[PDB]
Amino acid sequence: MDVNPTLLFLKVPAQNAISTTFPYTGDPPYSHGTGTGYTMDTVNRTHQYSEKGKWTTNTETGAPQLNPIDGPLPEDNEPSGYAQTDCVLEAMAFLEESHPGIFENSCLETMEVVQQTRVDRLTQGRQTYDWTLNRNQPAATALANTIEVFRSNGLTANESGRLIDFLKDVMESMDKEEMRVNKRSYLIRALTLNTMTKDAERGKLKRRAIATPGMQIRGFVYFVETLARSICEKLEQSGLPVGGNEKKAKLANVVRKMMTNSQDTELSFTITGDNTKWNENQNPRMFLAMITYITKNQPEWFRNVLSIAPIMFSNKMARLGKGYMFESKSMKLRTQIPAEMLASIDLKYFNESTRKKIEKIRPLLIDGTASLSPGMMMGMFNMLSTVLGVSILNLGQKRYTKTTYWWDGLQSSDDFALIVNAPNHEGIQAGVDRFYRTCKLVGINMSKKKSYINRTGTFEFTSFFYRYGFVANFSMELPSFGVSGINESADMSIGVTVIKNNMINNDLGPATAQMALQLFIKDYRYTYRCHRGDTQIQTRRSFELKKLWEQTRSKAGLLVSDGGPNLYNIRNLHIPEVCLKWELMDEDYQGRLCNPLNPFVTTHSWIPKRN
């Protein structure tokens, strides 16, 4: 006899059993090799996407920069990031006409936050790119680095404590011709963006090569993303800032609002999918135009300090990475070759696919780091791109499509789910071809390979699969369910809090969460050796546990790390442990516990010796 899980997937509904196609219960593949090849291929691809677009060299950089906007209309259905700014502006105009007062209110929220904000918040990031060592490093060291170099500079904003003056003086000394780095080299070094191959990319075969920005642009993107968070919060079609079960309800609510078919003489289909090349075919020029339109009738300085992000998006010279590691076959010897010399080396040592890639990029190499700005930086949490693409969905208000058919839905950073109506398959085909065309006229490229379309009731979006009324979700996988490794007092607390967060936010059912706590306490005891008092397992410690366990008066009322039982369950997870045990304990134990005489302070808590 043969066996197959695919036939349980035959009968069973696909969306409910969809997790069976979620094989991520094991380590992600990762990139052992330097991502630089994938980087070169991504840059090759985007510059091929905009090859019709002209480029002109930027001043003081030496670098070709391509501006796809006002390029021609594309020729073929193969994607291409060709758009027209007028589309963007009329889109935003129809948006503000639809949502009056939203722009000014979000603008005022941006004013008050920039006035109240402080530098202290940004430094709690992960792996901002430093420029001194020319390598990605933590953010605290990054802030120390920039404030000390600024103390060396003629500016004094690091002493101010405020943030927008800090950004301004960053800009001022950034315009300086020397720090020990000349102006051209310094502007190439400030705009530089590490390549840093993607890790943990679940659901592909080749790698995206997420590139990351530096701290200096981080505050500008922070301000503009705060605006985006405000405006999307006041929006009803965003998917990113809306989250949890509220987002879960928002999905169902928009499909409710559009699936209600009054005078249902018209058939209806509801696309889902994934807009390929999102980080490539988009552009910062459209973002700058949007920004200029969004803060209409506002303080001019605010306009400028929020327009500064898309311009430095509009010219960026990311690195390539480490380089390669050539090797001798006969003599059997190898070396790493930093690609900073790659604009000098012959085209014979390499692999042929690699060779053709080099000659494609070798013209586009200035200081060795590749220059490009027809396309967005890979893997930023921009979400103003959602503010863009949602306007397309807003165009399908029947006032403004000005025809019988019309679209609407929601759209996160890469996923999208339209909902249309028209009197026939022919009319729906007409309107959806119109949409796809429009969406390309703004420079957004809906893939024709890994997308699809269907009657209403079933549609994917952001992995929150929505069958007719069921809203199963597989956004993020369960993580670890193991100890945090600090002490027997808080590790347990940390684990329970993590379990609570992931049952309240995500779809950790209680049926698995009790089992998770079960594995957690197993690991807790096996790590700190401290099984139950009333047991038969041996270790170092078990003497004192079998001693205290009879020493007590109330037996089950004991903390777990000393012989105690675990009274937790899904009812009482937010609370700590000793609150649940306190008045179930006798005064001897309780007096021994909470006492300042302990060196431990909470007596279970402590600091381990460093190693």
């Binding site: 066996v3 695919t6 036939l7 349980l8 997937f9 696909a14 969306q15 059993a17 069976t20 196609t21 979620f22 991520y24 219960t25 094991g26 380590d27 593949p29 501006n67 906007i69 209309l73 020729e75 259905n77 007028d86 589309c87 009329e90 105009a93 003086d169 315009d175 592909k204 075969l205 200029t292 339109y293 209409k296 898309p310 010219n315 390669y324 050539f326 190898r334 070396t335 692999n351 729906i428 085909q429 024709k448 890994k450 997308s451 699809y452 269907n454 069921f470 199963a472 670890s480 193991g482 059912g509 209680p510 009790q514 089992m515 594995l519 197993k522 041996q538 675990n566 369950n569 899904i570």
Partner: protein, 511 residues
């Protein structure tokens, strides 16, 4: 505080039509919509347009699996053919440093013939692995009989092991200028690997690996009492689940893998410069006796300095085996089988007295794969998550909300079996077992081929459900899906078998 140079960069960042920031700002602030979009649309080429089509019933051809050599196993430890030398139920207070429990179990078995190879490797040097195994046995007897009981033993350097791990195989870093004169150099042999064809062996391994073993293989402790309703529902679901799962052979692989990877990571973080012996030791409680430390097989860990987690560590692995090779020589092109004599199995009549062979293959795993093989209890948990998701879906479509409706009833409601001119149906037991083992093999044969296949089969199967329920689905480009699937089907047998399963599913579904 723009300083103008930013106004320079800005004016250079804009579209070609507008040459300044200020004219741009004035245009935008003085902007209005005039219906440009319709002129743009009518202006456009009609070629640029996404045309729907009927994703018809007969359209999706059977995905063609790649052709080439047969698929070959790559697991870090064999799965069906292995066996375990029991310890026969030691006491409860006696802890054991694992070497001595292993040694006790190896000491239990007699039936060791002279070693002579049974399978020609066809590459490498088979005698050297024979002499490696010899070194192992000799080192073990010699340490334990006549030394001061070392907790952990690291082997002696020899021609055999040092060959099988290649401590000389490393080349050395050098500068560019000194070697640029050389022309032998190449960037790297960075290219696609050899194709592989599906075969029957992996299917048999899976069938055996879903099957019930006899022991219990996992315990589970107590937690705070149950008062609220949702607590009771969680309790009953998890109890059903673990009771059904515990008698798996998948769970056997789970605890085996976890102990193996924990031991290796302990060693590598704690010991790098030394060939270490470790057993594939696992703790299992007998259904009717005491805790039993099973000895699956020995390991000879190779030296491991992990400057990064991604780095590979190589080693050698010895796991005993009853079933002969040469019945399925395609399954291993990689093993190096020895003969180690007879083991006197007892059947209901007579005595079997089958020979005993050993599969001293070599390998190398990772740091990362070791971590994620340590965390397969998560994978068990994930199987539970999936089943619970199924049941909550059935509870949303029907307000009965009855877990008990499926967990225990004798009702043929789940097909997982394909037979000649037939389809078999099973209960939730076999299916929980199977989902688990699928996830375990995902954890064992994790490979980007799998993830690509998973996404693409997911999208196409979703389309096929949309089709089979008469939801008028459409797809713009389909052969893109097919070629990308064929791109991701490179060599991995598990991927290949999921693909043949997809195929036969298409056929028996008829979409």
């Amino acid at each position: 505080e723009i300083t103008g140079t930013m106004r320079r960069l800005a004016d250079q960042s804009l579209p070609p039509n507008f040459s300044c920031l200020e004219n741009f700002r004035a245009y935008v602030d003085g902007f209005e919509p005039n219906g440009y979009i319709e002129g743009k649309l009518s202006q456009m080429s009609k070629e640029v347009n996404a045309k729907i089509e009927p994703f018809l019933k007969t359209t999706p051809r059977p995905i063609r699996l790649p052709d080439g050599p047969p698929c070959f196993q790559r697991s870090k430890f064999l799965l069906m053919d292995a066996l375990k030398l029991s310890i026969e139920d030691p006491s409860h207070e006696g802890e054991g440093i694992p070497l001595y429990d292993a040694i006790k179990c190896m000491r239990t078995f007699f039936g060791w013939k002279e070693p002579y190879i049974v399978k020609p490797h066809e590459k490498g040097i088979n005698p050297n692995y024979l002499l490696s195994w010899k070194q192992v046995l000799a080192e073990l007897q010699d340490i334990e009989n006549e030394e001061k009981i070392p907790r952990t033993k690291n082997m002696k350097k020899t021609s055999q092991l040092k060959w099988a791990l290649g401590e000389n195989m490393a080349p050395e870093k050098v500068d560019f200028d000194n070697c640029r004169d050389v022309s032998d150099l190449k960037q790297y042999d960075s290219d696609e690997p050899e194709l592989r064809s599906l075969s029957s062996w992996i299917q048999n391994e899976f069938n055996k690996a879903c099957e019930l073993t006899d022991s219990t293989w996992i315990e589970l402790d107590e937690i705070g009492e149950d008062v609220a309703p949702i607590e009771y529902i969680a309790s009953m679901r998890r109890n059903y689940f673990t009771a059904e799962v515990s008698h798996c052979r998948a769970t056997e692989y789970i605890m085996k893998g976890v102990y193996i990877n924990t031991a290796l990571l302990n060693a590598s973080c704690a010991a790098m410069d030394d060939f270490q012996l470790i057993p594939m030791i696992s703790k299992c409680r007998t259904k009717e006796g005491r805790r039993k430390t099973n000895l699956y097989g020995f390991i000879i860990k190779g030296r491991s300095h992990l400057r990064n987690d991604t780095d590979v560590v190589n080693f050698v692995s010895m796991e005993f085996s009853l079933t002969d090779p040469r019945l399925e020589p395609h399954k291993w092109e990689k093993y190096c089988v020895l003969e180690i004599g007879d083991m006197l199995l007892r059947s209901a009549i007579g005595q079997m007295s089958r020979p005993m062979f050993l599969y001293v293959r070599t390998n190398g795993t990772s740091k990362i794969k070791m971590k994620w093989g340590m965390e397969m209890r998560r994978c068990l948990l994930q199987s539970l998550q999936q089943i619970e998701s199924m049941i909550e879906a059935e509870s949303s479509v029907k307000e009965k909300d009855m877990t008990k409706e499926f967990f225990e009833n004798k009702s043929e409601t789940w097909p997982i079996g394909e037979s000649p001119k037939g389809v078999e149906d099973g209960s939730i037991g076999k299916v929980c077992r199977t989902l688990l083992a699928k996830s375990v093999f995902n954890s064992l044969y994790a490979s980007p081929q799998l993830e690509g296949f998973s996404a693409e089969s997911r999208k196409l199967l979703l389309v096929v459900q949309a089709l089979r329920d008469n939801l008028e689905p459409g797809t713009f480009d389909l052969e893109g899906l097919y070629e990308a699937i064929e791109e991701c089907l490179i060599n991995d047998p598990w991927v290949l078998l999921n693909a043949s399963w997809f195929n036969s599913f298409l056929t028996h579904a008829l979409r």
